[PDB]
Structure formats: C-alpha cells, structure tokens
Design an enzyme around this catalytic site. Structure first.
Site, PDB file in Angstrom:
ATOM      1  N   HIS A   1      -1.602  -7.699   8.741  1.00  0.00           N
ATOM      2  CA  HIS A   1      -1.512  -9.103   9.214  1.00  0.00           C
ATOM      3  C   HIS A   1      -1.252  -9.352  10.770  1.00  0.00           C
ATOM      4  O   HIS A   1      -0.395  -8.665  11.326  1.00  0.00           O
ATOM      5  CB  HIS A   1      -0.663  -9.816   8.406  1.00  0.00           C
ATOM      6  CG  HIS A   1      -1.541 -10.007   6.846  1.00  0.00           C
ATOM      7  ND1 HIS A   1      -0.751 -10.776   5.815  1.00  0.00           N
ATOM      8  CD2 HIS A   1      -2.398  -9.586   6.522  1.00  0.00           C
ATOM      9  CE1 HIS A   1      -1.583 -10.460   4.704  1.00  0.00           C
ATOM     10  NE2 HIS A   1      -2.814 -10.006   5.087  1.00  0.00           N
TER      11      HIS A   1
ATOM     12  N   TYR B   1       0.844  -1.330   0.044  1.00  0.00           N
ATOM     13  CA  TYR B   1       0.106  -0.015  -0.031  1.00  0.00           C
ATOM     14  C   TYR B   1       0.750   1.171   0.079  1.00  0.00           C
ATOM     15  O   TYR B   1       0.369   2.291  -0.427  1.00  0.00           O
ATOM     16  CB  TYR B   1      -0.846  -0.015   1.185  1.00  0.00           C
ATOM     17  CG  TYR B   1      -2.252  -0.909   0.907  1.00  0.00           C
ATOM     18  CD1 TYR B   1      -3.202  -0.367  -0.276  1.00  0.00           C
ATOM     19  CD2 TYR B   1      -2.370  -2.155   1.114  1.00  0.00           C
ATOM     20  CE1 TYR B   1      -4.144  -1.096  -0.542  1.00  0.00           C
ATOM     21  CE2 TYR B   1      -3.417  -2.761   0.616  1.00  0.00           C
ATOM     22  CZ  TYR B   1      -4.579  -2.390  -0.219  1.00  0.00           C
ATOM     23  OH  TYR B   1      -5.216  -2.919  -0.684  1.00  0.00           O
TER      24      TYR B   1
ATOM     25  N   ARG C   1       3.460   1.880  -2.212  1.00  0.00           N
ATOM     26  CA  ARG C   1       3.265   2.204  -3.731  1.00  0.00           C
ATOM     27  C   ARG C   1       2.249   2.767  -4.062  1.00  0.00           C
ATOM     28  O   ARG C   1       1.972   3.526  -4.743  1.00  0.00           O
ATOM     29  CB  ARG C   1       4.007   0.967  -4.422  1.00  0.00           C
ATOM     30  CG  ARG C   1       3.235  -0.054  -4.255  1.00  0.00           C
ATOM     31  CD  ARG C   1       2.016   0.016  -5.515  1.00  0.00           C
ATOM     32  NE  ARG C   1       0.941  -0.747  -4.900  1.00  0.00           N
ATOM     33  CZ  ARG C   1      -0.090  -1.043  -5.764  1.00  0.00           C
ATOM     34  NH1 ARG C   1      -0.306  -0.378  -6.909  1.00  0.00           N
ATOM     35  NH2 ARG C   1      -1.144  -1.690  -5.134  1.00  0.00           N
TER      36      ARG C   1
ATOM     37  N   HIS D   1      -5.459  -3.599   6.890  1.00  0.00           N
ATOM     38  CA  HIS D   1      -4.825  -4.390   6.139  1.00  0.00           C
ATOM     39  C   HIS D   1      -3.797  -5.152   6.832  1.00  0.00           C
ATOM     40  O   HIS D   1      -3.017  -5.924   6.072  1.00  0.00           O
ATOM     41  CB  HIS D   1      -4.183  -3.602   4.763  1.00  0.00           C
ATOM     42  CG  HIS D   1      -5.454  -3.224   4.026  1.00  0.00           C
ATOM     43  ND1 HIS D   1      -6.088  -4.047   3.218  1.00  0.00           N
ATOM     44  CD2 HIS D   1      -5.698  -1.979   3.459  1.00  0.00           C
ATOM     45  CE1 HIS D   1      -7.168  -3.414   2.465  1.00  0.00           C
ATOM     46  NE2 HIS D   1      -6.743  -1.978   2.473  1.00  0.00           N
TER      47      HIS D   1
HETATM   48 ZN   LIG Z   1       1.007 -11.928   5.769  1.00  0.00          ZN
END
Ligand SMILES: [Zn+2]
Ligand SMILES: [Zn+2]
Lengths: 707, 707
Positions: free
Chosen positions: B387, B231, B233, B385
């Site tokens: 993880h 994200y 870029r 977003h």
């Molecule tokens: Zn991951």
C-alpha cells in the site's frame, strides 16, 4: 436491623457460609477487597452539577452502590469501619440535601427533575439502595446520628419523590415502580406505615396508582411487561425488591401469591425475552443490555429462593455474579452442589395487556440449524417508550441479530450525547414505522404518530403453534391505518433431512383504496448479490423522503426486478449467508438504504436495509422466504453453498389453507401448508392437492418434502 | 513410505499416543469422525467451471484437504478404507487432468491461470497437500495404480506449475514459494532429484530464482517477510513445509540453520505481527485473518519440534488446534505436561529489506493500561500488494483496532464478489494514501501511485527505543513527493501514578514550495464530542475529491477550530473513550468523512475518519496526542471519565530535544522529552528547562511528571 431484601436470618446464614470454600466465600472476598480499597479513598458527596454520564451523577451512583456493599459487609463481618464509611457519607448527604435546589442540568421536557440527579428516576434508584444500606448499618449509629441522617437525607428524599412530585408517584410506569419501592421500603425502616400504604395504593391511598395497581396493569397473565423487555428488566428490580421487603415485614399480604404469583411469572418471562443473553431490543431499548444486568441477577436469586427451581441455576451460572444475600447464598449453594438443570427457552406467545387480549410478543425458536429466534411483535403500544411498529419482526441466528430492530436513539450515560438522554432522532427515526420491518402505508407511520389512538389499539393474535418442525403465528390489525387491514403470518421451519431452515413471511394488505405500500427489511451484514440489476448512486446521496423517518434514510440504490423471484443475498459476521427470496409482480421497486440523513449531530448508526415499494395497490400480499444457507469460514478459508438454494417460490390458497412451495436446487421442494382460521384443534384433519398429488396433515400446519 | 513433513518415525509415535488419553487422542478422534463422515459421501472430482468461492473451486479445495487428512488417518489406523478413498480420488484426477483446458473463468490480468483452478496459486496449494497425501498412501497401492496416478495427475500438475509457467516459477514472491514447495516435494516423492534442485535453485538452476533465493531475499534478518504480515503467514506454510521435507530427506543441507536460522526466525516474527490474535492488516490484507490460520498452526508445531521452546506452547494453546503430526504430538504432549510458558510479544523494529536496510515495521507495545500496540509502518513498498502508506500508523487498545488500516477491498472466497478477487476499489481506494493515517500532499498518493518508483524507495528508520515507560520511534522519507520531506516520530507512553497512557504523534513536513497537506485519522467507534462547532451536512452528500481515493469519501461535515487545542472524542465498543488532542493554528480544517462514494457495487465498508487539512504550507508540523480514557460499562451501567483529561498541549524544541507537554485536568502535566539525533548512547545526558525548572534524563527519552 436488616429487614428489607436482607433480614437477620440471611446475615446469620451468610456468616456461616463465608468461611467455607465455595462460590459464596470467593464472592465475599472479592467484594471485601473492592470495598477495602474504596475505603482508602476520601468520600466524595459533590454538589450536583452534571447530567447523565457526568462526574456528579456517576459519583452519586457509585455512592449508593458503595453504601449498599459496605453495609452488607458490616452485617457479615461485624467490622465497624464499613458502618463508619456508610455513616460518614450519609452525614454528608444530610448536610448537602436540604441546601440543594432542583438540578442545574434538569431537562423537564424529557423527565421530572431531581436534586441529586438531573432526573427523579436516578434519585429513586439512590433511595432504593441507600435505604437498604441505612437499614443494614442502623444498629451501628447513635440516636443523634440516626436522627440527622433521617431528617437531612432520607425523609427529604422520600418526600421529594412522593408528596412533592405526586403525579409521577401515582403513575403506572417503571418510573412509578422505582418511586413506590423506595418510599415503601423507607416506610418500613423509618416506621412510617402510611408511606407503605401510599406506595401500595398511591398518595391518596385511592387504589388508582401505587404498587398493586402496577402489578395488576403493567403485566399480562404471562408475566409480560407492557413497556417491553428492556424496561421489563429495569422495573423488575424495584418489583422484586419491594416484594421481598413486603414479605419480610408483612407476610400476611401474600405478596408472592398475589395475582396468581405474578411476581414469579414476571421474573421468568424476563429471562425468556432474550437471545444469546441479550434482551430483544424492541421499543425503547439499548442493544447491549443482557441477562447479567443487576436487576435480573437479583430477580433470579429471589425466584430461586422462593421456588428452589434448579433450572434457575442455569441462568445464574450464565450471569457469573454471586450476590451477597440469603437468596444469593442459596443460588451459590445449589451451584456448588451440582443441582444445575438446563433452562428451557420456549417458543411462546407472551400475551400483552393486563388481561392478555391486547396482542402478544411472539418468540419462535429452534435449534436444528443452530440457535435461532424469530421475534414477531403484534403487541400493544407499550406507552411512551413504545415504537410505531405493529407486526414487525426480527430474526436471530448463530449468535447474531440478522433482521434488525434499531432500538433507541440514545447513548446511555454518555453526557456528550445530550446527557445520555433520548435524542431528537428517537422520535423522528427510531420510533417510526419505516425504521421497522413492517408495512408502511403512504410514507405514514402506524396511527400517524398519534399516541392516544396507538395506546388504545392493538393487533389481534390469530394463532400461535409450535412443534419440532414448524413454529408459526399470525396476527391482524385494522386500526394502524383506518380502512386498511394489515395481516401477517410468520413461520420458522426446519427440514431434518437437509439440516436447513427457513423463515417464511406472508404479509397481506387489504384496503378499498389505493396506497403506496413499503415493506422494509433492515439487515445486519454485507450485501453480496442480487437477482436483478442494481447499481448504487455514485457521486451524490439524497434522503429517501421528507417525514416519518424517511428523511433519515439515504437512498443508495434502486432496483425494479422483473415479475417472478427477487433475491437479495448478504453475508453475516457469524459465518452465514442470508438470501431473502420474494415474489414480485414487476411493479415492485427495491430501494436500498443507509441510515444517516438529516443527522447533523452524528446521532444515528449507518444501518442498512432494502424496502419493497408497491405503488397504487388496494390489495397486495408480500410473500418472502429468508434462507440462512452455507458456511463462510475465513479462518480455514473455505466457503460452502454461498449461492441461495431457492430456485422457485409459489404461494397458493386452498380453501382455509395457505400453501408456500419453496423449490430447492438439487433438492426436494419444501411445502409449508397451514390452516388459516381461528380455532384449529390439534387433531383436525386437512387435505389439499398440490401438483396432482394429495397431501394430508393434522392440526395447524405441516412442512412436506416433495421429492 | 511417508517422508515429507511426516515420516515413519512420526507415524509410530502418533500410533502409541492415540491410545493414551490427552489432547492428541481427542484431536485424532475428532479428525477420524470428520473424515469417516466424509467417506459416506461419494467422491466429487468435477470438471472445473467456477471462480474463487464457487462450487468446483471449493470442491477441489475440499478434495486436497480430505486427501491429506484421510492419508494421515491411513497411517495411524492402518485401515485401508482411508487409503482407498484417497486412491480413488487421485485416479479420478489422473483421468480428468490431462483432458483439461485452461480454466474457463481464468482472469490472467489478476493471476496466472490454472487448470483445476482459475489461478495457478490454488493449483500449487493442491499439489502441496496432495503430494503429501499420495506419499502417505503410496504403500497401499498397486504399481499400476501408482503409475496412473503419477502419470496422469501428479507429474502433469508439477510440470504445469514449473516448466510451462516458468516466469512465475522462477519469481521471488509468495506465488513462487508455493510452486517451488510443491515441485520440490514431488521431487522427493517421485524420485526426480533434478526437480528438487530446480526447487532450491530455479529451473535454469542459476540461483536468481528458487527456494534458497526466496529465503535469502524475501525475509529481512529479523525474519520479516517483505509483502507484509498477511502474506507472511501465507508463504510461511510452503516455507516450513518444504524446509521440514528437506530436513527429513537431505539433512546435510542443514536447512534449519541456513542463513542464521531464517526459517525459525520467520516463524517467530509471524507470531509477533499480531494483536489479540489477528495479524496487522497492513498492505493487501483480510482483517479476519489470525494466528489460528493453518499455516501458523503448522509453523508453530515445526518450530516447537526444532527448538522445544515452551513459549511456543502459549501460541499453540491460543490456536486451539492440535495437528496430527509428529511435531503436533510433541506440542500436545508439552501442553499436557503443563510446560506452557507465556509467549513474549515485544516492542521491536522489524527491519525490512533483504539486508534490513529498507525501513522497518515498528511495533510499540505496553501492558500498564491494558494490552496496547502502536504499529508504525516506515516500511519498504512490499511489491504489488504493498500500500502507498509511508509512515502510516495504527493503534490497538483493549482488544480492538482503534486507529485503523483498511486492509484490502476484497471478499475472500465470495464468488458473487468478483470471484473473491481483489476488487477495483482495492486499487482506487485501499492502496491509496488517503485511505491511511499519514500525510497526503496535494491529494496525491505517495510516489503518485507509480509502482516502479515505490519499489525503489523506502523510509529511513531514524531510531527506535523501548523502555517500560516510553516506547518511541522515528523515520523519514524524502522521495514520496518531489521536493517534500516527511518525518514522523510516534511515542507510546504510560504514567505509573495514574493508570493513564498516551500515543504521541509529531509529523513534520518540509518543502520549499507550498502544498495542501492532509493528515487523516481513520477510527473505529462512535463520534461523541468535539471542542469546536461541527454540524453534519444534512440533505445531501458529495465526494470529498476526484482522484487518488478522495472520490470514495463522502464529506459528512467540516469544521475549522480556532487556534489552540482541537479535541475529537469517540467511543469504542471495548468500553473506552478516545480523544485526539491536536495543536491547530486557526488555518487547519478538520473534515469528517464516511467511505462509500463512487462505490456502485457496494464494495466498500462505511468506515469513518477525520482529516486535518492545511493549505498553503511549505513547512508544517502536525502535533497530536491520542488519549485512551474512561470506562464505559453498559452492563453495570456506569461511566467514568468520559471527558478528555487533556487540558493543554505544547510542543517545543530545546536543542537536540523535542518536548511535548500534556496538561492534565486535576493532575500533574505529562512532559515527554526525547533526543532527535540518530545516535544516542544509553548513558548520554540530556538537560532542558521547562517553566523555570531544569530537567535531566539519560538516553533516548523520558516522561516527566510535573506537579
Ligand atoms: Zn492499507
Ligand atoms: Zn424499534
């Protein structure tokens, strides 16, 4: 003394070329740097203890390569250090070889034993390179050094590979070719003429085996080698090596004219059996093997030296490897001179069998939609390396293998994977019919795994034709399952106006008895969509079946489309979508599989496929179209035409004609019409009626646009 | 009229450069050719009906791309055919856009709706591109055409994207940057300065949201974007686009100096977060995304136009895409002038958090044994977003990802895969801790998948040190699980004497209560050996677990190695073998998995891994070494050093020091010694005894050779 592949004339030519800027000089400097560095390390001629990919096996292989490379440098430079290294290593072999028993890691159930190596085949490769190295350094030796090397190393190895294992020496297979080539060249270097005759006509000099029998049997008139492309390129090296040695020693034999120039045909066909530089992985085959392999680099130099064909410089350019030989110099000079011309990769039916009447390996190519190859295999068995796979096919597009052949279950030169040998799953998966893209009757492989019957039965090539818009071939075999006739015709077509292409498949099964019919499609890519309801099994997986390869397939999902058009769409790394559109009768299941069951040693890849299953059919035709469509560019982040453009599919018989109508979304219907019968002259006229209009075409086939 | 990224100065310079031969002229000609071809197709401004990857979605994307490119060509060629096509498309948008409902395939749970598109995110990109196109062609228009285009398309889009979706517009995230960039540039073009100020300071202009807050909050002082490289870029394009327009219209704001040059830092760090041209696939990420992405092509031209750094030309050259802009001309000229200097990819700890205190993204690189990168992620959550992957790591070697991060479960712009949206398994697999290479306690993900707790917690980076022989970093987190502390240090080391390299992992777990501890290792390649008995399950597969991602792993095999050294060896397509050698206590299970359970829509790849599982431990340390070794060349057909060269492993504590001693076969043991304290001056002296000898080193760490 060089007089095998390289002769004194080649050395003199190389000596002049080495001191002029060019490809040859740069290759020479690179070999010299590498050999000079290797000379810094002490010699290693170890007692043989390891199997394929192990240290002793790889060191012995490195030794033959270094001995050959150093011998070449000795001849070119006249520097004694290169000969001294080759001599010291050979003296070590001379001391080691007489004391060696059969290899401790030998596995005779798989291949015949060796002393230096687990198997005799590697010993044969060792002799082919080593004899050349000795031939190259022989003028540097004293008489006692020569006698010790010959009596302790070369003659015991030549004996071991011939009179001591005569069954394999007299065999007509790639292993035989390597043994005959090494012993025959040894016959020339060591003045043993009977060895040359034994190499040419077998140990009894009968004519039943030997080199000449191999050239007359293993190749078809089209230069196609019966074991398939991967072993074709393998056997190529001893063929062209011994042939070059025969020509330099006994030119009266006319070796390069023998059997109408079969050695040259064999080289050229080896090049042809590839796509995006990799050999077609049919029969036993490692998928990474490409045209830069050393046997074909050599073969190209020899063929260019014989013919001067500038088209071969195209191939040599792609190989990126200049050889330090007279012929390698000729290649380097033609490249430097700008003489390169493009090499023609053909659509072609490469006939199989020594007489060309045992089927064929058919390659259909077109470039209108990018580089595409449809490979159709109505070929003979190919002996022990052959797969049980009559009428199977592959499809390549945009650099990648889309519809796939597994190749071999084997990890080359990975000792931890059973010594790099063919694994148990090469028999129980890789050779089985269910592993290929062709019809399986009653969960039973072609010929029911009977090698002798398979070796004696082949499909018949019904026809092959290729023009700019239609490439098409059909073949037939009634012996894969007695009482069952299997006939397939495959067409690779393109429409100039759209820029689109299709692979078209008509697979007819005819029996008087009812059978289960499976037609697999093994594909490369990610499943993206289906025409019909498909939900995968979610908390357990079981094998599809119990024998003949079905025990290795997990069943991941089961669909049963309503009668009409079934569509399966996947997406490939190469940026393209692929949709197979197939006609289903409502009694056809689609079984989606993943390879990997009954695989306790992690020997199989997780390959994906789907199988069309029709139960209880006497006669059935599988009709399908493979459509490459769209563009998927994850770098610029656009997608075009991801949905299949096929709306409808129809198949009709019109007298001797077959018609396949492909309805396109917002487009003209594509209508493939072809004549079904055996002989169809180029100007033969055909008409038929489709949808109230009349269409006409000359010859085998025509693709029509119906707006 | 152009006054955004492109101004009239740029246009003039381009006009003179398109006559002279070179990289710019070739790019111009290639663009002119693509657009001219586009102009022969009639415009298509369809009523929006499809989701991501579908026809109207991809057509409206094509349209903004074409409007921009045709606009640039107008300015360079002064040929009104280009402006007339843009004008006619915008007039069709002017007539269509006011009639439009919300998108019929809107999915407001995933993202905010648009009208042109299913989500407003694509509407913002459309505006960023189209406002520039309109700016480029404005001088060609009549006043009534300009009024209709502004009243019917440009102003309604900007209003829909700001005042009508105010929450998202004021949000500080990548969705926010795209919206504020388009609206602010519209403010310059349509002379609405209030819009420019709202873009910089939010709609209420409080300063809680808006573009300046984004630059002050979403980047660390090292220019690391909070959401991750993929994200980063994405947001980079609106960041540099608006910044360049601000500099061309209000250069008093000094935007390229704002916050110690954050924009230029942000560009440079985007380049750094890649290996072999691909961005690290951490957090939600598509693995195929690389530095040739348009956002970074643009950012590199803008940074080169600001700084003139010849190192940026290295990146440009690798991107292979010249831009038709003033900055893109300067890049093409520098490349033509041969001013290219190698770009320096560094070992570095990229701090996370506004102020650089919320952990870090740590990259360790070396080049001694080929191109190698160890990516260590003791990072902040990265919002939605992110993880759940604290302390995870990856390993890259010889061009390939060897120890892997899944990235997102999503098929970008594939409409048949849920409209290219993040899939259900992105939540249930890809975000889960078991999908990563870090410790999972009691089959529960870090923070137990609670996003509010995760957003409030982050690891502490303990130290980071890179020299030519040792790169080493450590971090810790005590909030991933109540009452459990997690500490990991990872080292990338090289030995000059051999060509050998090692990745060394020490993962300490401390708790007052017993827990089940899983440390997965997800790998790319073919499993080829273990030094303990392992037979795969043969007749059925079942999921490893029931929740938190374990329901998606098939358990293919279970092993329980004896106390001592466990070794797992796999082979990668890059031609190298990898052996993980780990210390095991006889109580550690190793579980071999394949992804694919509970995956009814075929949404997951068949990725492989193995998991070290230890039950009933309060405190436990996972010690392992990852050894790249050997060469596997299937073209030349040799293998070297396929067997691991690790013979033994020992881990010891010596005061403030940790010692890892790696026994090497026929070699000097490699002994890594490092100081664990947060504070270690470079001239600090360390001393320890190992096997009777005393050793000393200055500073953080040292690798010793013990013969
Ligand atoms: Zn991951
Ligand atoms: Zn096969």
């Amino acid at each position: 003394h060089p007089n095998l592949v390289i002769d004194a004339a080649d050395v003199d030519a190389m000596q002049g070329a080495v001191a002029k800027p060019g490809r040859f000089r740069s290759a020479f400097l690179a070999s010299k740097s590498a050999v000079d560095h290797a000379l810094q390390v002490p010699l290693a001629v170890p007692v043989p203890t390891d199997a394929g990919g192990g240290y002793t096996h790889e060191q012995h292989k490195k030794n033959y390569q270094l001995m050959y490379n150093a011998g070449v440098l000795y001849q070119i430079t006249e520097d004694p250090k290169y000969a001294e290294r080759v001599r010291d290593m050979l003296l070590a072999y001379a001391d080691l070889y007489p004391t060696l028993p059969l290899h401790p890691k030998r596995r005779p159930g798989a291949e015949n034993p060796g002393k230096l190596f687990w198997q005799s085949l590697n010993e044969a490769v060792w002799l082919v390179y080593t004899i050349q190295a000795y031939d190259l350094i022989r003028p540097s030796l004293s008489n006692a050094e020569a006698e010790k090397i010959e009596q302790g190393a070369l003659r015991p190895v030549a004996k071991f590979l011939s009179v001591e294992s005569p069954a394999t020496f007299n065999k007509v297979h790639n292993h035989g070719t390597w043994l005959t080539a090494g012993v025959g060249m040894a016959g020339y270097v060591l003045d043993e003429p009977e060895w040359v005759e034994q190499a040419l006509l077998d140990l009894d000099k009968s004519g039943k085996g030997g080199f000449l029998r191999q050239l007359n049997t293993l190749f078809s008139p089209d230069g196609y080698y019966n074991e398939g492309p991967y072993y074709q390129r393998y056997a190529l090296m001893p063929f062209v090596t011994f042939a070059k040695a025969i020509e330099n020693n006994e030119p009266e034999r006319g070796i390069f004219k023998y059997r109408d120039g079969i050695v040259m045909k064999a080289i050229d066909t080896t090049i042809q059996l590839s796509y995006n530089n990799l050999f077609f992985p049919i029969n036993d085959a490692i998928k990474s093997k490409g045209i830069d392999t050393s046997e074909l680099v050599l073969g190209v130099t020899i063929a260019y030296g014989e013919s001067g064909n500038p088209q071969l410089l195209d191939i040599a350019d792609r190989q990126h490897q200049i050889l330090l030989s007279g012929d390698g110099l000729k290649v380097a000079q033609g490249l430097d001179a700008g003489a390169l011309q493009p090499y023609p990769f053909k659509s072609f039916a490469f006939r199989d069998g020594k007489d060309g009447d045992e089927g064929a390996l058919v390659v259909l190519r077109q470039q209108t939609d990018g580089d595409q190859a449809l490979v159709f295999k109505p070929a003979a068995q190919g002996m022990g390396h052959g797969h049980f796979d009559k009428l199977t096919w592959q499809f390549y597009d945009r650099g990648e293998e889309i519809v796939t052949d597994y190749g071999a279950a084997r990890f080359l030169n990975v000792e931890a994977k059973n010594g790099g040998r063919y694994l148990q799953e090469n028999e129980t998966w890789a050779k089985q019919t269910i592993a290929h893209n062709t019809v399986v009757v009653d969960e039973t492989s072609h010929f029911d795994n009977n090698l002798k019957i398979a070796n004696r039965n082949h499909p018949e090539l019904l026809f092959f034709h290729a023009d700019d818009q239609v490439k098409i071939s059909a073949a037939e075999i009634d012996s894969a399952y007695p009482g069952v006739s299997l006939k397939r015709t495959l067409a690779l077509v393109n429409n100039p106006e759209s820029g689109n292409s299709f692979a078209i498949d008509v697979f007819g099964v005819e029996s008087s008895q009812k059978h289960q019919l499976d037609l697999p499609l093994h594909y490369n890519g990610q499943l993206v969509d289906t025409n019909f309801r498909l939900q995968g099994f979610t908390d357990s997986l079981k094998a599809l079946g119990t024998n003949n390869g079905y025990q290795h397939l997990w069943l991941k999902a089961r669909g049963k489309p309503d009668s009409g058009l079934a569509q399966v769409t996947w997406l490939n790394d190469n940026g393209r979508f692929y949709t197979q559109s197939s006609l289903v009768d409502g009694k056809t299941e689609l079984l989606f599989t993943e390879l990997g069951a009954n695989d306790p040693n992690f020997n199989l890849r997780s390959e994906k496929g789907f199988i069309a299953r029709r139960n209880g059919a006497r006669s059935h035709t599988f009709v399908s179209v493979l459509e490459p469509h769209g563009e998927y560019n994850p770098s610029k982040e656009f997608t075009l035409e991801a949905e299949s453009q096929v709306q409808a599919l129809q198949h009709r018989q019109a007298g001797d004609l077959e018609l396949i109508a492909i309805g396109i979304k917002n487009g003209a219907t594509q209508l493939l019409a072809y004549n079904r019968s055996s002989n169809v002259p180029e100007e033969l006229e055909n008409i038929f009626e489709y949808d109230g209009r009349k269409y006409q075409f000359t010859g085998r086939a025509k693709l029509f646009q119906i707006t």
